[PDB]
Every structure is written in C-alpha cells, then in structure tokens.
Ligand binder design. Sequence first.
Ligand SMILES: [Cl-]
Length: 344
Amino acid sequence: EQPEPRTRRRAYLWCKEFLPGAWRGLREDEFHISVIMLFQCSLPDTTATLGDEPRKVLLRLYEAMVLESVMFAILAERSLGPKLYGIFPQGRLEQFIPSRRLDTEELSLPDISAEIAEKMATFHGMKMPFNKEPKWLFGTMEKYLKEVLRIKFTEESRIKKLHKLLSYNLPLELENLRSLLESTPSPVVFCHNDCQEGNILLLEGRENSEKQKLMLIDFEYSSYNYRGFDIGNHFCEWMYDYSYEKYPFFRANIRKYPTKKQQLHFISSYLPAFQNDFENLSTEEKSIIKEEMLLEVNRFALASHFLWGLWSIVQAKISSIEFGYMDYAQARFDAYFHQKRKLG
Ligand SMILES: [Cl-]
C-alpha cells in the first residue's frame, strides 16, 4: 500500500536529511515507501550502500513526548530496543527489525516463556531518569475510575453493561485491592507494563535458536512500577487472544492462565537473569524466594484485570477502533473475581 503523496514527500525529506550515505544523495523518484501509523522506507535494490547506513527503516508518525523520546533513545543506546536514526516533531525513524509478532498460544511454549522472563528481567535492571515512585498503577486506576463513574452511554446495550460493571462498587473494591497489594512486597523497577504477545517480536532467522530469538517493543506504558505488575500482567495475557476477526474481536479463556508449574518455569528463568548468582543459594532459599514471588505476581495480576478492565470501559466511550470494549471489560472483571476467589 502506498501512502498519501504529501507524506511520501515528507518521508522522503526525513530519510534524505536524517540518514547517512546513499540516502543523502537519493532522488525522490528512487524513494520506496509502503504502509505497515508505521511505514517501511527503503533504498532501491540497485543503490549500493556507501557505508553502514540501513537499507531500510521504519517511519513512525505520531512532557510525555519528552519522556517517551528520551526513553526510546536510551533503550536504543543500550541495545534493548530498535536503533533510533531520527527524531523530529512529527515522528521518528527507527531500525526496521525483520520479524513477526508472537501469537497468544506461543507464550506458553517453554523456550518462549523462558526467554520472555529473561528479556523482562533485563528490562527491570534498567536505570532510567524517570520518577522512581511507583504511582503509575493506582494513579492510572484512580484516574480511569473517575472517568468510568461519570460515563453515560446512550445505546441500550452499553447502558446495561455499564450498570452491571458499576454494581460491583468499584471504588470500594479498588481500595480492597490497594490494601492487598500494600501488604505484598514487590520491588519497584522499570517496567514494560504491556508485555503481551503483540509487543514481542520473534526475530527472523532466529526461530531455531533456544535463547536469543525475541525482542520486546512498544514502550508506550513503560514506567517505574511494582515488578509484580509486570509479570502478573504478562501471565494474564496468556488468557487473551486479540486476533479474533469477528466481534467482540478477542477471545478470553481463563483456563489458559499459566499453571503454578508454568509460573515456576517462567520465574526460574527470571530470577537468575535478574540476580546474577541466584543459582548459588540453598534449594529451600530459592524455594522460599520462588514461593513468595508467585504469591506476589498472582496478587498483582488482579491489578492487571482491574486496570485494563477500567481502561476498556473508558475506551468504549472515547475510542473509534472496532473492538468489543464493554465485553472485554466484563471478561477482565470476571477474571478479577475468579482469581480473587481462588487466592482466598
Ligand atoms: Cl522450581
């Protein structure tokens, strides 16, 4: 798919002035761009590279803007994210990573899950120049609840759906969750906050490799937060498939939440990646750490339900993307109460 000519010529100008070598001398008629909002920009196959410039790039078109840009640049410097080739008011030129997204069902593959754990442990070792107070989680939940209390739907169906969600007394329930998570030690670390299959790239040519085949992307929500949240949110995503092509445009299956065995496999890979010499501790000390972490992560998974449930109600009101947001909200709240119950 070709972009609008206006943006083709803007994209041409950005690539020509921000990228080195063959790009600097490129004529407009030689420029290739296609829509992946995201575009692949590329040199002609018959133009040789002059040095080490990329033959192709990703063009992403868009206080918080400052923070997102600094974060992306730092993760790029550290080789945790795609390289950053250009930044400008309207967007960014990034490294194009040959890859595909993971599907929901691949998250449980033991090699995949072990790698995700390792990649997340590395992310959580990142020092960033951002507020270290973990106020994102309840701050965001409080902010969405405020909106949800005042939503009025006009459509018959949505009015009824909102009434049911509201009948739980969400303000009181949020405070119950706050109290549970307050009594629950979890280190504050730099979190991805959205580690779903959609944001994990499987790297082309590396599919046959045991350990180095993924990259985490999409740092929109990344902030300092309870480590429990990041892992618990990830576990929750085992239950949700968003590639369903008919309404509501997702499928939920509570039965696909990782078993304690699967959770143990994941954290047995997280822990030594986070703590270099974890493997030298007494079996019962590793056991104790693992037991206490699993209780931590499953309590914080309740916050994943609550937060994304609240987020989905707000989106029902304000979004124009086609997705069964009210139904999704109900699925998340259904899982919140189900898991609250099994936990006790
Ligand atoms: Cl174990």
